[PDB]
Amino acid sequence: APTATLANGDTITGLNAIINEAFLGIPFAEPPVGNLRFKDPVPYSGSLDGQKFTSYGPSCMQQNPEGTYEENLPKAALDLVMQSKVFEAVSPSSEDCLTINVVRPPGTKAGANLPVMLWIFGGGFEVGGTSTFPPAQMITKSIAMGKPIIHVSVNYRVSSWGFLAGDEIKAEGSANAGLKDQRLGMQWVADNIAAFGGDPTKVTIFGESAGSMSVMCHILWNDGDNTYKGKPLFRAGIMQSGAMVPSDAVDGIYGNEIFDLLASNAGCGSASDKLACLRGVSSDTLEDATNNTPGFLAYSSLRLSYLPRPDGVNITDDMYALVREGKYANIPVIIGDQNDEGTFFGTSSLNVTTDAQAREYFKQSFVHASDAEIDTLMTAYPGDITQGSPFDTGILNALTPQFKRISAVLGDLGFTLARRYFLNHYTGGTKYSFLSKQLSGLPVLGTFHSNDIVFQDYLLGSGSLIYNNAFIAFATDLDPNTAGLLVKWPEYTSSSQSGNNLMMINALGLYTGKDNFRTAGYDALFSNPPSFFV
Ligand SMILES: *[C@@H]1O[C@H](CO)[C@@H](O[C@@H]2O[C@H](CO)[C@@H](O)[C@H](O)[C@H]2NC(C)=O)[C@H](O)[C@H]1NC(C)=O
Ligand SMILES: *[P@@](=O)(CCCCCC)O[C@H]1C[C@@H](C)CC[C@@H]1C(C)C
Numbered sequence: 343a344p345t346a347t348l349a350n351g352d353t354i355t356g357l358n359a360i361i362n363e364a365f366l367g368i369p370f371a372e373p374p375v376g377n378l379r380f381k382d383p384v385p386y387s388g389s390l391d392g393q394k395f396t397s398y399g400p401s402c403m404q405q406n407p408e409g410t411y412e413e414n415l416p417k418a419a420l421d422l423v424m425q426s427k428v429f430e431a432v433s434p435s436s437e438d439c440l441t442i443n444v445v446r447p448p449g450t451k452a453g454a455n456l457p458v459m460l461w462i463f464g465g466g467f468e469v470g471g472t473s474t475f476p477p478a479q480m481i482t483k484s485i486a487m488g489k490p491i492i493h494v495s496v497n498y499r500v501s502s503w504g505f506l507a508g509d510e511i512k513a514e515g516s517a518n519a520g521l522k523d524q525r526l527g528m529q530w531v532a533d534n535i536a537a538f539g540g541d542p543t544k545v546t547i548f549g550e551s552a553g554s555m556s557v558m559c560h561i562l563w564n565d566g567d568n569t570y571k572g573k574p575l576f577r578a579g580i581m582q583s584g585a586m587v588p589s590d591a592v593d594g595i596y597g598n599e600i601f602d603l604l605a606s607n608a609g610c611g612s613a614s615d616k617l618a619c620l621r622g623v624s625s626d627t628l629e630d631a632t633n634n635t636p637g638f639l640a641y642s643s644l645r646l647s648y649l650p651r652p653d654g655v656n657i658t659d660d661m662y663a664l665v666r667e668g669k670y671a672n673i674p675v676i677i678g679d680q681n682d683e684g685t686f687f688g689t690s691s692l693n694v695t696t697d698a699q700a701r702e703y704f705k706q707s708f709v710h711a712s713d714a715e716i717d718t719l720m721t722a723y724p725g726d727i728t729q730g731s732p733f734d735t736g737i738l739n740a741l742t743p744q745f746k747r748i749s750a751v752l753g754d755l756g757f758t759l760a761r762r763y764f765l766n767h768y769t770g771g772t773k774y775s776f777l778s779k780q781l782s783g784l785p786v787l788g789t790f791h792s793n794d795i796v797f798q799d800y801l802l803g804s805g806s807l808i809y810n811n812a813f814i815a816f817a818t819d820l821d822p823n824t825a826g827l828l829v830k831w832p833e834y835t836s837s838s839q840s841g842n843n844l845m846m847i848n849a850l851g852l853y854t855g856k857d858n859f860r861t862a863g864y865d866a867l868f869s870n871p872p873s874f875f876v
């Protein structure tokens with residue numbers, strides 16, 4: 343029933359889900375298979391005329407989050423699960439996965455010109471798909487608010503398939519393939535969304551975790567030039583847990599070690615041209631070799647095997663330097679965090695129980711950090727269990743004498759304080775920041791990383807006021823205050839500003855606070871950002 347005529351004259355049919363109309367699985371690029379592997383996406387050249395788009399297509403190949411060159415139970419078990427016919431059935435994945443999904447309010451028509459919210463999923467740049475982030479909660483609330491929006495989601499390559507680095511990839515001009523996938527989808531939205539009733543000039547990009555860092559990367563792309571055919575690709579961005587990526591260049595030391603490890607694993611350790619050898623191995627072999635490099639939940643943790651890295655061409659430099667140097671798109675932004683962002687990552691090093699061990703783990707993790715810096719870091723984040731994350735839980739959650747400490751460091755460097763650094767240097771437009779404490783008291787994890795996904799897509803809670811309502815008003819009017827919330831969200835100018843600069847959330851509701859916590863950790867970490875790059 344639902345129909346749309348694209349920018350090339352093709353008329354496609356979607357699905358009527360009663361509460362919304364959706365067009366799922368629209369191919370936006372030519373399948374990145376064979377010799378197209380690891381390469382930039384090629385625009386989809388073909389005809390969709392007469393086709394129905396009523397189901398999500400498969401996700402891109404996934405990597406075992408517990409993957410590693412080592413052997414163990416978590417790895418073995420997840421592999422058992424991931425290769426199961428039942429898993430392969432409920433959650434299909436493939437190298438041919440570059441599709442886009444359009445979901446809208448019922449009765450929407452071409453010319454409606456509704457604001458567009460483009461979702462970029464998070465999955466540690468190693469797993470993930472669009473199908474697991476239902477847009478219905480957001481769409482329904484938008485209608486109820488009288489501020490209807492259209493939800494767009496894009497599949498992008500993850501893990502080795504989307505983020506392979508090293509000397510060969512650099513020389514070839516193929517770095518950050520997964521981000522390029524996201525970029526093409528944006529371009530597809532500019533060219534076709536009007537046919538669906540969206541306004542290509544009212545696009546707000548948003549993601550969580552890896553998707554959020556992806557949003558920051560888009561703000562930094564091509565030194566801030568976000569135009570396509572003369573017009574900006576998006577008027578705003580919402581970053582849920584994640585800002586700049588703390589990483590070395592594509593041809594840096596870890597980018598290359600990982601490339602070589604994967605090559606040995608696929609049986610290309612002897613190839614004169616390892617990259618050409620990698621294009622020739624079957625999907626099985628490649629999936630296997632990849633599952634034998636660390637996953638984001640493995641001991642390596644934050645020191646990820648695959649993630650966005652500066653390439654000197656599309657992301658021209660260290661991401662912290664670009665932000666300092668003003669090389670970003672000038673747009674209004676919302677960027678927030680959950681109180682306890684690092685408790686998940688802290689679960690990866692529960693065999694680290696003494697301070698001597700904590701010092702070596704950090705040393706292993708941050709190869710560019712001097713002993714002085716490691717020592718400053720370990721003073722800024724003391725062993726005192728009352729000081730760590732879950733924050734403000736006293737002597738509880740002492741899985742080990744280092745869990746709370748390690749959880750505090752990782753969540754701050756990767757998200758929470760990284761956000762403050764951005765906020766303190768960004769002048770491209772109005773800023774709004776939030777800190778959630780909605781799940782205070784939840785054992786072991788606290789107000790954990792990802793909980794916002796629940797309250798944005800699955801259940802309603804005090805947080806939904808922000809994750810849905812406030813986010814909908816911002817995409818529509820560029821001011822979250824138009825949502826008519828009882829607590830006015832203050833503009834964030836600086837972390838040193840007087841007065842509350844943070845919207846906050848607790849189980850009962852909203853309130854405002856200050857972004858002045860853990861200042862010693864901020865300076866321990868960000869006085870010279872490159873000391874803690876991976
Ligand atoms: C905690 O566990 C990790 C993971 O096994 C240990 O690190 C591995 O140790 C083996 C044996 O020495 C090495 O071959 C691997 O290279 C290490 N893995 C990684 C990912 O680095 C680590 O030594 C243990 N830590 C403590 C404090 O016991
Ligand atoms: P994000 O996608 C992790 C990004 C790590 C960046 C380091 C440079 O992680 C969460 C994604 C979410 C959708 C589910 C759970 C994930 C972890 C917090 C476990």
Ligand SMILES: *[C@@H]1O[C@H](CO)[C@@H](O)[C@H](O)[C@H]1NC(C)=O
Pocket residue numbers: 522525564655656
């Ligand atoms: C990457 O950079 C080059 C050089 O500026 C540019 O021509 C190319 O179009 C960029 N890629 C993307 C996806 O924007």
Ligand SMILES: [Ca+2]
Pocket residue numbers: 509598602
């Ligand atoms: Ca090499």
Ligand SMILES: [Ca+2]
Pocket residue numbers: 566667668669670
């Ligand atoms: Ca500038």
